[PDB]
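Limitations
The structure tokens in this dataset are predictions for the assembled complex, not deposited experimental models. Users should treat interface geometry with appropriate caution, especially where small molecules or nucleic acid strands are included. An illustrative entry is reproduced here so readers can see what is and is not provided.
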Amino acid sequence: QSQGIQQLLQAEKRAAEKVSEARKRKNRRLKQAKEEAQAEIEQYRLQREKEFKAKE
Amino acid sequence: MIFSIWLLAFSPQMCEHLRRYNIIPVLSDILQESVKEKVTRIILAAFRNFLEKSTERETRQEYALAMIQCKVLKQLENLEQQKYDDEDISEDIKFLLEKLGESVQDLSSFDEYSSELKSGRLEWSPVHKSEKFWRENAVRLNEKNYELLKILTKLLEVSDDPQVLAVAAHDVGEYVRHYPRGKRVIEQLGGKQLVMNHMHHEDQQVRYNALLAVQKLMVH
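Predicted assembly:
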């Protein structure tokens, strides 16, 4: 009998693991947004810098 | 004998110390079992001396509350309605009805559950059974450095009574249902192991409440 309840602890542990992995993916993926935004901001900044240098 | 106890209760320093003999229950038993005029009067005298000579507020509250855990105030109302010709009965009834009229408000809290835990009187009582208690208070199982959790854990560890075990499993089920962090606290205390063992208890009422607690613990 009791072994099935230990298998529920194992299922709970797998659930906590699945939740933790998804949360860690979200934490990294949210930081990747900042890193890619900064690259695209600099790409534009350098473009307006070039256009202004050309105008001058 | 209750005259001997009434005489013992004349000193504040004696009233502070006499608590360890567990004397209020035996007087409260006789107060229900023996309506005899003398016996009634000397219990009222002993109870008045214990409470009134307690210059320590904690001791005063404790004598008033121990009488209320014995539900003496209801019996004092029965004795107020009963015919007695003596002012030394009548006026000491009304005195104790006023002072126990404080501690009845303390007990008739959700703390009727607190006292059932403290005394070990776990049962299918209205305060165990009613959702309102847990729905408003479940977190309080952590109070006094987890005292109520420690009691329920000890009872689930060493009680012989399937009612106490099943009641405690139900109490754990509603604790987790109404306080989500309570799941983490039972998991940190390891109290789950008792419930998971009692899944194979000899009583179907315990096994049912253990399974129901495992459901409320592991299933959303």
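Some entries come with short summary sentences. For this one: The two ends of chain A are 84 Å apart (CA to CA).
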